[PDB]
Amino acid sequence: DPEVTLLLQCPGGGLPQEQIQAELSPAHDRRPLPGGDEAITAIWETRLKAQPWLFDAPKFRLHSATLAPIGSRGPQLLLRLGLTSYRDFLGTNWSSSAAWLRQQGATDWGDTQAYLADPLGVGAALATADDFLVFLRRSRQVAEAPGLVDVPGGHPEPQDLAGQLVVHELFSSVLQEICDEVNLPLLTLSQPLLLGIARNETSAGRASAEFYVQCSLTSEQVRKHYLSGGPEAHESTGIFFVETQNVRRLPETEMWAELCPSAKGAIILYNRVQGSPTGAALGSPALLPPL
Numbered sequence: 085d086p087e088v089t090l091l092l093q094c095p096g097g098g099l100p101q102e103q104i105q106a107e108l109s110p111a112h113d114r115r116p117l118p119g120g121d122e123a124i125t126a127i128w129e130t131r132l133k134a135q136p137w138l139f140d141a142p143k144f145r146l147h148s149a150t151l152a153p154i155g156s157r158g159p160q161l162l163l164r165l166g167l168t169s170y171r172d173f174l175g176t177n178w179s180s181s182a183a184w185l186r187q188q189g190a191t192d193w194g195d196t197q198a199y200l201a202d203p204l205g206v207g208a209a210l211a212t213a214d215d216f217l218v219f220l221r222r223s224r225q226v227a228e229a230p231g232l233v234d235v236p237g238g239h240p241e242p243q244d245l246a247g248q249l250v251v252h253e254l255f256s257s258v259l260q261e262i263c264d265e266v267n268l269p270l271l272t273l274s275q276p277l278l279l280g281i282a283r284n285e286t287s288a289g290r291a292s293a294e295f296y297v298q299c300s301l302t303s304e305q306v307r308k309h310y311l312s313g314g315p316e317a318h319e320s321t322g323i324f325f326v327e328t329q330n331v332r333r334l335p336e337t338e339m340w341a342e343l344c345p346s347a348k349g350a351i352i353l354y355n356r357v358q359g360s361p362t363g364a365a366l367g368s369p370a371l372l373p374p375l
């Protein structure tokens with residue numbers, strides 16, 4: 085799967101909010117482009133003169149994520165974050181020249197990402213009471229990954245001392261994206277666990293935090309809530325469900341070629357961190373069938 089690489093696999097079946105520290109610092113920002121940020125401004129002007137209803141928004145930038153020694157006490161993960169924007173994304177990661185920017189960042193900074201916006205996404209492996217995961221179909225008309233399968237998620241917007249507020253906004257935002265797109269009540273959702281971080285190589289290496297969330301509704305009840313919003317209550321064009329039993333071998337199915345890279349990231353991390361049991365009971369052949 086060349087279009088997704090794992091930056092982080094969390095221990096303990098995934099990390100809760102209270103085990104994660106953030107460092108939000110301008111040291112973690114994108115570096116100015118070699119020929120100046122005027123190249124970003126030019127791409128943005130061209131875009132607004134065609135679609136003048138577009139607006140900019142701030143975004144979190146992922147610099148790096150350091151895990152503690154396994155089995156340790158205290159905070160288990162440090163997220164190093166800076167700030168970026170939708171405008172900086174369109175002029176860097178989404179640019180036709182994005183590979184040239186990666187090569188120049190290797191040359192100048194020893195860092196393929198130094199000249200990239202790299203906005204942090206969030207996605208969820210969302211499980212129902214009857215043991216299915218939730219999938220959404222993307223419109224065939226949008227710019228990014230048209231007609232492909234996604235999971236719930238989005239790109240959160242700003243507003244360890246300022247750190248703990250940032251970690252809270254990341255966890256909050258994955259629940260808000262589920263309520264906004266799937267139309268589920270907030271009280272049917274568990275607190276999220278962070279499973280890991282995946283990178284989208286088709287989008288010059290921009291990263292998404294992938295989370296596990298449990299819902300107290302069945303697949304039939306989740307479907308009713310999604311549909312009862314009507315066509316204007318969601319950006320996706322349809323909802324569907326795959327048994328957690330069958331998610332184990334999804335990379336061997338025809339579905340795999342229709343999944344966008346960030347959804348492939350969510351499913352690989354679900355399989356390694358929530359699946360793949362370590363104990364004698366769940367690891368027994370009748371419960372973990374070979375092959």
Ligand SMILES: CN1CCC(OC(=O)c2cccc(F)c2)CC1
Binds near residue numbers: 140141170
């Ligand atoms: C929904 N509608 C209006 C907004 C358009 O998108 C944006 O201009 C945009 C939306 C969110 C964040 C952002 F930075 C930019 C898409 C069509």
